[PDB]
Structure 1
Amino acid sequence: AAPPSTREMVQLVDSLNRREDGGAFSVDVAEAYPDLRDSYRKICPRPMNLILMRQRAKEGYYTSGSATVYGDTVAASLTRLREDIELLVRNCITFNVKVESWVTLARSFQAFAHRRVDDFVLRHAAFLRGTTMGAEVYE
């Protein structure tokens, strides 16, 4: 089972940018708002955004060394990318807990991103067809 190439992983992370999110999951809140860094660290002490995820994809961090590429199921495959997607969503829903519309946007992105990763895993690993999907597990 050959892992996906770094170019394919970069193309996968690039496909997670949606026009309807208007860069909400791409912006680096620390670089964009220097005068609010410390408040964002209190709420989201672990940083995550699609710029960091694209660097990780490009460098082989999701598909090299001890990264889990193919697991027992689609859901349990590309675990490092799934954890990064989950942190991105957790940070957004925690920060926006009082703004329901922006929580719903983060949940919409979560479902969308795990489905994009599920379909990508299936394109590279037909032997995982029919197993648990990340879109069924992550919520």
Structure 2
Amino acid sequence: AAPPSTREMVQLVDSLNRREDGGAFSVDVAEAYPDLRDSYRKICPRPMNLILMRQRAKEGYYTSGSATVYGDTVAASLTRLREDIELLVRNCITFNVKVESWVTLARSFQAFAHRRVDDFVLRHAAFLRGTTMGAEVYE
């Protein structure tokens, strides 16, 4: 199948912004909390949020060069975007581990995000129908 366009990838990332999340995954923590940045970066050495992900989508980072677009399964497709989703969730759960509202939100976003990517892959790549889904692998 043809790779998704960058516009399609941007639309996909845009679709990951849920009003229910209240901008939780869109905020650059290091910029918004300068006095906690060192403490945050200790626990979360790698930045990730939906602003960075939309920049990556717009640039072709998820769909160009060495990026895996279609893998041998749905789960194994759009690996760079899946890794970013996984890092967003990992950072949230690790740093906010003692706050149940945050962890619950993070897990809800994780499941939602992988389902959205799964659906997107299947819309573009019918040859991957019935293979392992990202929603089944990630958790």
Which TM-score tier does this pair reach, normalised by the shorter chain? over 0.9
- Structure 1's unaligned 5+ residue stretches are none
Q: CA deviation at 1:65?
A: 0.2
Aligned-residue CA RMSD (Å)? 0.5
Q: Equivalents in 1 of 2:55, 2:101: separation in Å?
A: 29
Q: Which runs of 4+ in 1 moved over 3 A?
A: none
Stretch deviating more after TM superposition (31-40 or 84-93): 31-40
Q: Equivalents in 2 of 1:121, 1:6: separation in Å?
A: 14
C-alpha deviations, 1:70-91, integer Å up to 9, x for none? 0000000000000000000000
Q: CA deviation at 1:36?
A: 1.2
Q: Equivalents in 1 of 2:84, 2:11: separation in Å?
A: 16
Q: Could you state the TM-score of these two structures normalised by the residue count of structure 2?
A: 0.99
C-alpha deviations, 1:32-77, integer Å up to 9, x for none? 1111111111010000000000000000000000000000000000
Length, aligned pairs only: 139
Q: Could you state the TM-score of these two structures normalised by the residue count of structure 1?
A: 0.99
Give identity over the alignment, percent: 100
Q: Equivalents in 1 of 2:25, 2:72: separation in Å?
A: 29
Stretch deviating more after TM superposition (99-108 or 84-93): 99-108
Q: CA deviation at 1:101?
A: 2.0
